[PDB]
């Protein structure tokens, strides 16, 4: 196994939401086999961010997910050469964006080159007004569509005042190494939370727990 039980995470995201440019650095640690990761995020440029930090978090690696023996782990088989993903998020009020991550490994460290582009968010909407509280736990459906590993998520952000703001993600995953065998369809349950933050989310501690299953208990 190229992958150790304890892997470090290095991350730089360059992005633009509704015109606003920003650069965010990440430094964290994770247990790939337990499906757990936590990282410290620091806004390096464009702060304070004039939009809800929460729309970024899922962009801050499915290599951190507990896979049972009876599902093919595409992600952990992708290393050490690594893999990329591209994602389109579609929000109920027209807000759309495209995120990509190119993931590489060097010794005990995953390096992440992340790009995040958002547009069409209404000025009076929960994202530009900063009314989001968190992502609800989600289930990512994994399947193959025209020879590409694809994940669909129908989810929501909890808003101030008991309301939800609906998310549809579609992610395409591609190993750098030709002939990493595609897995069979399956599910990944996700648990993403902001553990701590300063006043304007210039510094954020992020945690994710993910588990792969066939649908049964």
Residue numbers in the entry: 2 to 61, 65 to 221
The authors write:
The system studied was a reversibly switchable fluorescent protein (rsFP) which is a representative of a class of proteins that undergo a reversible photolysis reaction from a highly fluorescent “on” state to a weakly fluorescence “off” state. The specific rsFP used, rsKiiro, is a mutant of Skylan-NS33 specifically developed for ultrafast time-resolved crystallographic studies due to its ability to form crystals that diffract to high resolution (∼1.1 Å for single-crystal cryo-MX), high photoswitching quantum yield (∼18% Trans-to-Cis in the crystal), and high protein expression yields. Structurally, rsKiiro is similar to green fluorescent protein (GFP) with an 11-stranded β-barrel surrounding an α helix. The chromophore of rsKiiro is formed from the Ala-Tyr-Gly tripeptide at residue numbers 62–64 in the α helix.
In this study, we probed the light-induced reverse reaction, from the Trans to Cis chromophore conformation, initiated with 2 ms 405 nm pulses at a range of optical flash energy densities (0.1–6.7 mJ/mm2) after the initial Cis-to-Trans photoconversion had been driven to completion using ∼13 mW/mm2 of 473 nm CW illumination. The initial examination of the chromophore-omitted maps clearly shows increasing occupancy of the Cis state at higher energy densities.
